[PDB]
Design goal:
This protein folds into two domains: 1-97 and 217-391, Alkaline Phosphatase, subunit A, CATH 3.40.720.10; 98-216, Alpha-Beta Plaits (2-Layer Sandwich). The protein is built from 13 helices and 13 strands. The chain has helices at residues 32-39, 46-51, 53-56, 84-91, 109-119, 131-145, 169-182, 223-229, 240-243, 258-269, 283-289, 294-314, 366-376; strands spanning 5-11, 71-75, 123-128, 148-152, 157-163, 192-201, 204-207, 212-215, 233-237, 251-253, 275-281, 319-324, 343-348. The chain is globular. Bound molecules: 2,3-dideoxy-5-O-phosphono-alpha-D-ribofuranose and manganese (II) ion (3 copies). Isomerase that catalyzes the conversion of deoxy-ribose 1-phosphate (dRib-1-P) and ribose 1-phosphate (Rib-1-P) to deoxy-ribose 5-phosphate (dRib-5-P) and ribose 5-phosphate (Rib-5-P), respectively.
Length: 391
């Protein structure tokens, strides 16, 4: 192998400007990093700058440097959708024609009618909501009537809440499985069906740890599958395991925050493995992008950038670091959905003694997967062109 370990970091939703097909998505003018840099009156990301972020594109506070630490370019998304699952599946070598759907006005009557017909239960709610808000609103009705609370978030999910002492847990899971089958349909395709059992009483409802997720498997065998099948290590940190429904994963490290994600990254750098360490930093998307909060987004980016010198100090000569994103989620944009954007790509190894250069623009995210596959000598994915030899 040219690299013994590859550390792949997805900064979730950290887009670097509207993509060529942005218009098809109503995403003209979108620019995640750029609008944040403007809001902040200049972003302080000196370590990303040293890697060459500003060389990809200059933005307020983010300037190009003469001798970037690593190689740099941006990546264009080829798949139809702009959701997390699509982006990640493409990164690991897939092409996804069918987008996952979001439901800002709740779910179509047709879907809910079929779920009712298959379960024998009424459905109440049917709107985007936090799990807390929705429980206070409808928790008591749910208890009294044996109804299912069905709701969504700004993401592609269908959540089903039910009191544990009214609807038995195993029945809630059965219902979620029925919903999971019904939602395998392009009309209403959800990335994730989530059981949200709760207990307590009106004015004091708490969601229990008996939560279960029903994700779809990637539409194809990924580069992670191939690494795993060739006895390499595939360490998933954060949401990565869930995003791929565990496919190709040899070890999974739960995280509770961006800083916690960086701690786990540091843990893997202390590990003697051969293969891929794969981190998703999710706060950018879940806490700031969807909530349209450029101030908190900007602070999160600075907090993350400050963690980077430790990562640099720990990389070995045969380690490669890859930093990218999976779409945009511009916090100064209409609505609550993702934005169709280019994503940055930074590729750094301490063995690059002369620094890096610009790479040709990556025409699919799958170039990352192809690079990983070629490095480890596993079967090349169907999509993607490796840039391994450019490094
Ligand atoms: O509002 P909730 O119930 O806390 O969930 C919000 C989203 C739903 C699933 C995950 O995206 O987090
Ligand atoms: Mn838009
Ligand atoms: Mn995402
Ligand atoms: Mn999202």
């Amino acid at each position: 192998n040219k690299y013994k370990r590859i550390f792949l970091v997805v900064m979730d939703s950290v887009g670097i400007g509207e993509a060529p097909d942005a218009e098809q998505f109503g995403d003209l003018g979108s620019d995640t990093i750029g609008h944040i840099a403007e809001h902040m009156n200049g972003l302080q990301m000196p370590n990303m700058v040293k890697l060459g972020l500003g060389n990809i594109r200059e933005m307020k506070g983010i300037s190009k440097v003469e001798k970037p630490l690593g190689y740099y370019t941006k990546m264009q998304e080829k798949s139809t959708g702009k959701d997390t699952m699509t982006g990640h599946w493409e990164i690991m070598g897939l092409y996804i024609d069918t987008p996952f759907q979001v439901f800002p006005e709740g779910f179509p009557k047709e879907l809910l009618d079929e779920l009712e017909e298959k379960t024998g239960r009424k459905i109440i709610g049917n709107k985007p909501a936090s799990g807390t808000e929705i429980l206070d609103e409808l928790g008591q009705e749910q208890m009294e009537t044996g109804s299912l609370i069905v709701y969504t978030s700004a993401d592609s999910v269908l959540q089903i809440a039910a009191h544990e002492e009214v609807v038995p847990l195993d029945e809630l899971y059965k219902i979620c499985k029925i919903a999971r089958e019904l939602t395998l349909d392009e009309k209403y395709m959800v990335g994730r069906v989530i059981a949200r059992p709760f207990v307590g009483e009106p004015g004091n409802f708490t969601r229990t740890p008996n939560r279960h997720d029903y994700a779809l498997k990637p539409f194809g065998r990924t580069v992670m599958n191939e690494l795993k099948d060739s006895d390499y290590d595939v360490i998933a940190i954060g949401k990565i395991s869930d995003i791929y429904d565990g496919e190709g994963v040899t070890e999974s490290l739960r995280t509770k925050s961006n800083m916690d994600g960086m701690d786990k990254l540091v843990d893997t750098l202390n590990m003697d493995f051969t293969g891929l360490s794969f981190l998703n930093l999710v706060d950018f998307d879940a806490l700031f992008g969807h909530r349209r909060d450029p101030q908190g987004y900007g602070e999160a980016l600075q907090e993350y950038d400050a963690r980077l010198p430790e990562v640099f100090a720990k990389l070995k000569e045969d380690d490669l670091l890859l930093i990218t994103a999976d779409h945009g989620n511009d916090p100064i944009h209409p609505g609550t959905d993702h934005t169709r954007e280019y994503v940055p790509l930074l590729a750094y190894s301490p063995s690059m003694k002369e620094g890096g250069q610009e790479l040709p623009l990556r025409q699919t995210f799958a170039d990352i997967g192809a690079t990983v596959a070629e490095n480890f000598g596993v079967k090349m994915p169907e999509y993607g062109t490796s840039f391994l030899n450019e490094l």
